[PDB]
Symmetry: C3
Subunit: 262 residues, 3 copies
Amino acid sequence: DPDELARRAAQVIADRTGIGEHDVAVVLGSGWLPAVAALGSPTTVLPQAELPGFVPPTAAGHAGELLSVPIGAHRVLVLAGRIHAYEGHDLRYVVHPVRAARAAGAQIMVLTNAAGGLRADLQVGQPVLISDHLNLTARSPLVGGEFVDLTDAYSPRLRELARQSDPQLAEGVYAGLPGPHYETPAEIRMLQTLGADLVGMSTVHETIAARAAGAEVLGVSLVTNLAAGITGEPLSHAEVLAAGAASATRMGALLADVIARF
Amino acid sequence: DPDELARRAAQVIADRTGIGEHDVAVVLGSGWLPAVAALGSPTTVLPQAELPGFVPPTAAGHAGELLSVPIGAHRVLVLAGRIHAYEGHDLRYVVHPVRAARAAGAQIMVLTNAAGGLRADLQVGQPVLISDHLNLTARSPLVGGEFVDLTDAYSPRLRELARQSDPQLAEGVYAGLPGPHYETPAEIRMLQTLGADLVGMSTVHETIAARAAGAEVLGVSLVTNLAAGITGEPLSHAEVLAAGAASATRMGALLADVIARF
Amino acid sequence: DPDELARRAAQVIADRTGIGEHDVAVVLGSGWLPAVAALGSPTTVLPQAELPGFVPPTAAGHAGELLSVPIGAHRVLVLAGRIHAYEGHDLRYVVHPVRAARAAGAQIMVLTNAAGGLRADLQVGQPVLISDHLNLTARSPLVGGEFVDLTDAYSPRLRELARQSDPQLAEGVYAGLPGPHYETPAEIRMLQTLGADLVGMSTVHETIAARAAGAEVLGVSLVTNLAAGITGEPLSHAEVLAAGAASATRMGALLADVIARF
Ligand SMILES: Nc1nc(=O)c2ncn([C@H]3C[C@H](O)[C@@H](CO)O3)c2[nH]1
Ligand SMILES: Nc1nc(=O)c2ncn([C@H]3C[C@H](O)[C@@H](CO)O3)c2[nH]1
Ligand SMILES: Nc1nc(=O)c2ncn([C@H]3C[C@H](O)[C@@H](CO)O3)c2[nH]1
């Protein structure tokens, strides 16, 4: 039961961190791992394998960590190593950290990702608030009659707060596609016609899970590349990571500043 | 085998109803349950659990009913309680009532749903004939080489007939999305660009199954809300049901009048 | 493991054909089976059931063949009988022949299909190079962190080469949908707004698999019908096959000429 394992994850967190309430959570996207040191000093580092429900039962492999990091007046659960739908596991594992985090008291999820830039003004290394998404996975992490209203899925308030920290932060619609392949240029023209400014392979489920769980969502894309076909520059995951690395100190400091304003 | 269980469901129906041919079938959408009393007097009430193939093997729970209701010169199988793709069961259970109904002689499926209104003229409580759909689930209830031509999936004739009953019935394209989450406003702008007038979480599979089974389809959406972001009014399932309730007497009477014209 | 069975398929091929490297592969689409005799003389005919990984474990049935055909200075693996996603088997079986073929040395995949024509100039019996695709299946045949850049998924060079053979070959964006149902006219207007010139039920996975495997892709659609609603002419699979048959000699000769230019 996802809610059960989430509650049980949250007991482990509170137990092992000594912290009954982590007020905020962050999921670090592709390339955002080096941003951790910029976020602050982890006080607890929890192997995700030690937390109920974080690891898909099968396809074994050394999952990442959940950090408890004091950021301003918040204990923040920071997810380092996430599961993506394209790994082929149930979405419950994709969104488990949001649910676990919510069970541990997280009222804000900061959902970060690497994204391809579609909108003309967006440039590589530029962080972009997600104002909205297009879930183009044909999936939901919610599994029977759980309506969730997705109006303001990406809290305008958290965005204003984000902008108080960085007033020039652009915002954009993010299209979540399954991946793990990147888009054809024709897909990218499609996405633009669909109203996407950003394209990625995560986030949408986590946002939906977050909202269903009663949490607010700040989405932040790091534009790591302009989306396929826009310039002709070939996309690569190693370019996405390297872009995230080159931008990671700034991204961490951005998040720390923004999260402290929450 | 879906066709087998459908044939076997149809034997149960004919046996328990005493009616060899139900000429029409109705699937009642979200909120349309109170419309039953408006449809007429059920002569037989069949627990869906007593009909082969209606209940997904696992995820147990007290399924609904299939009513045999005389409506005009028709015995009409009326599905009260339906299964939605978002329940996570195979689409065969989503569309089993259409197939069962077709096996019991249904030549017309009346597929009703609650939908969010996208088109400018559509208002809450307004019934809307489905002129067509966008199946945006990336799925089909058909499972190997079963081509079905979906040209006129929503019989223009049944629509004209529907309009003979209610000449001001608008019509619209319905986008079937998986749910169970409602759309982001950005998704709703996407859908509009895609040509949808209505958005929901059912119908498309049933229509496809219906057409594959050789049956005609009248789709009717009750607009229960304007789609996300159009007004800013938050979407809720309880608003969808309450809208369906407020509109249910009319909807039942509409369907009874329309079905008798068939 | 798809790569393992692919390598093992390739050993079988090299063993049974006596040919260590098949430089090219062709997947024949719906209706393209009669084009085989036009392609050349098969030197080996391999039941797909005798090749590791070609047949889905369950849903048994007499799969087709993989032909080794000398075409110009190439040994070409020609897939006769393919698996489509709509058969409900894992995509690994959909794309196994591309992977097997790549393991047997194929550097070019020629991916042929029947498609519905959306673009105004496209006519029935007209072959159309795929310049790009819209993967509208919400799926990928790649299964964990396998980025594949899909920029130039359909090699412009192979297209120019194709055009050296037939300078009037049009090109078009192909939208791969799951099927097996054909589109509603509203879906077809959607697809056009999305930038599709052609619509089908295959190819996109094979292209993605091909590219992931390091192979170049020539896509060729035979326009078998104008897409749903464009003319009103009802779509049928038997029309698709008959169109493919009427056009098969030409299509085979086209492919033979084009493949020899590779
Ligand atoms: N879909 C998609 N298109 C892009 O151009 C793109 N650029 C970066 N990313 C993100 C998403 C993943 O975190 C990770 C993909 O491995 O990087 C992208 N995703
Ligand atoms: N997807 C979607 N968007 C809406 O705005 C909307 N409004 C009503 N409905 C319908 C569909 C289901 O029967 C049921 C959702 O629980 O109500 C909607 N479905
Ligand atoms: N989706 C779709 N729409 C069409 O109008 C259409 N016309 C031909 N085809 C192709 C695809 C399959 O090979 C096969 C469908 O059985 O024929 C189509 N596919």
